[PDB]
């Protein structure tokens, strides 16, 4: 028993992290087979950062400028290109510890594990969600650029995040592994603002089911309709619940024998009347960074 915010085991991704250096600019890259992926702003000096001409700055670079270290071992770059906001550096050695992997662009409200890296060396691992406003609430210091977010889908590492930047409000922004930004954000040191954030309703419902699986029942009660629930949901800045949301909370509903709409009634009361000095799974707020499958992985002891 017990419930923790649990990250995936990171060992598969740790063997892929390398240090990329251009002149004095240093960040992290992901060594998969004979390619090293990394954010393109590794080619910037501190004074290039306002609005860099990436196309021009790259033409000026040669393979010998890109110094790539995997631990103590040096990797010869033999080719260079740019796809959106990533560099792909062809190197002369395939990573022998390349795991089975794919690149996925994940949806807002999906979770993943962040391996925070500095100087090509993993330092820490934590669980994150793509917020509805396309930002993550991370812990990243200068040099964390190129750190990756990932899921394990059965036997396959799903890479879904490379870290680029910190926004003024202290929230984090980055790309999929094909160098495209989550949200409306650009790799410039400019005054960029996040949009209006929202609670991930389906996740909160998935967490209440975890609380019931773990023998916590105190918030069950009344039965509401879908449309009455959503009138309340959006006053409290929760995402409207769709019929597909209700569908994917089906396994949890079946396993607990609590109808999704009965759990919506539970949530509606908690939103209105508060938790009144109560806790659920060690928390005195409603947690929205557990997806349905996250609750199943921890509660059923899925291994990899």
């Amino acid at each position: 028993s017990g419930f923790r915010k649990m990250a995936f085991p990171s060992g598969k991704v740790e063997g892929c992290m390398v240090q990329v250096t251009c002149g004095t600019t240093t960040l992290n890259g992901l060594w998969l087979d004979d390619v090293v992926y990394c954010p393109r702003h590794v080619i910037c000096t501190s004074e290039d950062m306002l609005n860099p001409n990436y196309e021009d700055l790259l033409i000026r670079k040669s393979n010998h400028n890109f110094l790539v270290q995997a631990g103590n071992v040096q990797l010869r770059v033999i080719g260079h290109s740019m796809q959106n906001c990533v560099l792909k550096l062809k190197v002369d050695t395939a990573n022998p510890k390349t795991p089975k992997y794919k690149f996925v662009r994940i949806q807002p409200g999906q979770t993943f594990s962040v391996l925070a890296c500095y100087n090509g060396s993993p330092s820490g691992v934590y669980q994150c969600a793509m917020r509805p406003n396309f930002t993550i609430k991370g812990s990243f210091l200068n040099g964390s650029s190129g750190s990756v977010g990932f899921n394990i889908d059965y036997d396959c590492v799903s890479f879904c995040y490379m870290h680029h930047m910190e926004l003024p409000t202290g929230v984090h922004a980055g790309t999929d592994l094909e160098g495209n930004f989550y949200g409306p954000f650009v790799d410039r040191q400019t005054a960029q603002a996040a949009g209006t954030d929202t609670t991930i309703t389906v996740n909160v419902l998935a967490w209440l089911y975890a609380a019931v699986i773990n023998g916590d029942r105190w918030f069950l009660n009344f039965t509401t309709t879908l449309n009455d629930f959503n009138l309340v949901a959006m006053k409290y800045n929760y995402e409207p619940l769709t019929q597909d949301h209700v569908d994917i909370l089906g396994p949890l509903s079946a396993q607990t024998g609590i109808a999704v709409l009965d759990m919506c009634a539970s949530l509606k009361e908690l939103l209105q009347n508060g938790m009144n000095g109560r806790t659920i799974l060690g928390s005195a707020l409603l947690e929205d960074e557990f997806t349905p499958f996250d609750v199943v992985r921890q509660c059923s002891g899925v291994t990899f």
Binding site: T26, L27, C44, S46, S144, M165, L167
Partner: peptide
């Protein structure tokens, strides 16, 4: 106030 691209030097 300004976005930080989180390279090290």
């Amino acid at each position: 106030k300004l976005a930080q691209l989180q390279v090290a030097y």
